[PDB]
Specification:
One of its GO terms (cellular component) is host cell nucleus. It comes from Coxsackievirus B3. This is Genome polyprotein. Belongs to the picornaviruses polyprotein family. By secondary structure, the protein is α+β, with helices and mostly antiparallel strands. Helix content is about 40%, strand content about 15%. The protein is built from 19 helices and 17 strands. The protein has a five-stranded mixed beta sheet. A three-stranded antiparallel beta sheet has the order 7-12-11, with helices on one face. The chain has a three-stranded antiparallel beta sheet with strand order 14-15-16. A hairpin with a 2-residue loop joins strand 9 and strand 10. About 40% of the residues are buried. Bound molecules: 2',3'-dideoxycytidine 5'-triphosphate (DCT). 2',3'-dideoxycytidine 5'-triphosphate binds near residues 176, 235, 236, 238 and 328. 2',3'-dideoxycytidine 5'-triphosphate (DCT) binds near residues 159, 176 and 236. It binds a RNA duplex through helix 4, strand 4, strand 6, helix 8 and helix 9.
Length: about 475
RNA sequence: CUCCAGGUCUCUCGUCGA
RNA sequence: GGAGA
């Protein structure tokens, strides 16, 4: 990922974009009961907690690119992953517009509560001015698409969210890229059946966890990844993808039946253009976080990436015995033999990728089923039914969430949802949690689910 | 006097119906 | 800046 060019938006006929600088996160009634290290992310240059240049820091994610060709490893990598995807009958036929916009089995409708992006964001137009789920109208949509076209700039905002205290101090707030309604629709039309087949089939064939429910799915995972575990973390994956990985992705899209016409939408992702406040700029490489397809294409690329590193580092390796599940940058995998992920990291570095030891730390340790995480959840088998596995979100991360709110009107929903995460920590931990919640006047006013009821419904789901 | 801040997945709750 | 009660 690299910013090639910056220009004034006026110069390029673009309006200045209103980008919020005030967080919506307030300390909650539970802010004191529990301990936490996160505060809301820095959103402006005048933040008193800033110990570094803000605008320098938020964009620092664009580490650079590496100029390499699609090498013999990538190519093999692609043919292998493609051969899996071929077993699924991914239709390259464009999705019916009513389905691409207002949802179908395997693909939910557009988020109508979010920005419509450029140009509408500066015309003061909301998604709901153009769409209604209730009416399923496409009239105003086609109109707007005719008028404004495709490949519009993506609008860059800072994400309102909690960050570690060093990420607050270092200004490493996160950027997202608001994709225009038009582009989201066009991509969903073009790639809807791919999205759908992916969501309806998470596992070791797609190599994707997208569409799974950790409650039900954690039990399936150790069966699928029966070998020795492989797991690492990425630093700024999305921003680290050089163009060659996109070339790889286009090539696998081509294998699947996609025309050069349709693969060209990948070009709008790799080579993208953005609005940020009063500037218009160009990024070469990097997956733009916020485009349509970001989870699916990030994941497909990860399947190509890890396959490549293996084929490269361990020359003569049998990928028919390799198994991986990716969720964007997040990956859990296994191979029948011990693989040194520090070496896969060294290789990764040569392709622009920064891979680090899993779940923080400074050794590429053994990855056991004990310490491995996926989607931030640990794996624990039931003590009573050892083939059912618990997705275990650390209580410390649940704690971080409850200590804040964006609106106390939601405290009941918020806490209930937190409960459905916490209980997989066990009865001891859940009741301590329910106690600490109850240790505060407002906590005594909430309907909390009983552990016994949670465990019951869970066991009941496997039926 | 409010609103402006992306893609998605999962779950949950609210309302309305068979 | 724009949209609205
Ligand atoms: N609002 C968000 C937050 C995250 N993500 C996706 C894109 C990248 C992926 C990883 O994000 P995190 O791991 O949660 O961020 P981090 O580990 O703190 O920072 P980094 O991406 O540098 O590892 O999640 C997203 O699409 N939208």
């Amino acid at each position: 990922g690299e910013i090639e060019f910056i220009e004034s938006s006026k110069d390029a006929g673009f309006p200045v974009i209103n980008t919020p600088s005030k967080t919506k996160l307030e300390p909650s009634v539970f802010h004191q009961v529990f301990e936490g290290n996160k505060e809301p992310a820095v959103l402006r240059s005048g933040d008193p907690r800033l110990k570094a240049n803000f605008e320098e820091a938020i964009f620092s994610k664009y580490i650079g690119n590496v100029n390499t060709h699609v090498d013999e490893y990538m190519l093999e990598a692609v043919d292998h992953y493609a051969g899996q995807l071929a077993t699924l009958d991914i239709s390259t036929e464009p999705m019916k517009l009513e389905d691409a916009v207002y949802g179908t089995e395997g693909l939910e409708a557009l988020d109508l509560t979010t920005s419509a992006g450029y140009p509408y964001v500066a015309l003061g137009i909301k998604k709901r001015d153009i769409l209604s789920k209730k009416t399923k109208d496409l009239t105003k949509l086609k109109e707007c698409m005719d008028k404004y076209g495709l490949n519009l700039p993506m609008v860059t905002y800072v994400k309102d969210e909690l960050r570690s205290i060093e990420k607050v101090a270092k200004g490493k707030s996160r950027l997202i890229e608001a994709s225009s309604l038009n582009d989201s629709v066009a991509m969903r039309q073009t790639f809807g059946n791919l999205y759908k087949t992916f969501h309806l089939n998470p596992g070791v064939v797609t190599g994707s966890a997208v569409g799974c429910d950790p409650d039900l799915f954690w039990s399936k995972i150790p069966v699928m990844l029966d070998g020795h575990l492989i797991a690492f973390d990425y630093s700024g994956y999305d921003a680290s993808l050089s163009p060659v990985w996109f070339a790889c992705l286009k090539m696998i899209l081509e294998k699947l039946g996609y025309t050069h016409k349709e693969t060209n939408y990948i070009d709008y992702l790799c080579n993208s253009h953005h609005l940020y406040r009063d500037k218009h700029y160009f990024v070469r490489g990097g997956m733009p976080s916020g485009c349509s397809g970001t989870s699916i294409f990030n994941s497909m690329i990860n399947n190509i990436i890890i396959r490549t590193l293996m084929l490269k580092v361990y020359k003569g390796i049998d990928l028919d015995q390799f198994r991986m599940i990716a969720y964007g940058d997040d990956v859990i995998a296994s191979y029948p033999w011990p693989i040194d992920a520090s070496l896969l990291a060294e290789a990764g570095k040569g392709y622009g990728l920064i891979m680090t030891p899993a779940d923080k730390g400074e050794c590429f340790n053994e990855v056991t089923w004990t310490n491995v995480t996926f989607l931030k959840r640990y794996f624990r088998a039931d003590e009573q039914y050892p083939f059912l596995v618990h997705p275990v979100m650390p209580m410390k991360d649940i704690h971080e969430s409850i200590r804040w709110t964006k609106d106390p009107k939601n405290t009941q929903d918020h806490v209930r949802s937190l409960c459905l995460l916490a209980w997989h920590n066990g009865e001891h931990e859940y009741e301590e949690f329910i106690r600490k919640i109850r240790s505060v006047p407002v906590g005594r006013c909430l309907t909390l689910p009983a552990f016994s009821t949670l465990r019951r419904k869970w066991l009941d789901s496997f039926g």
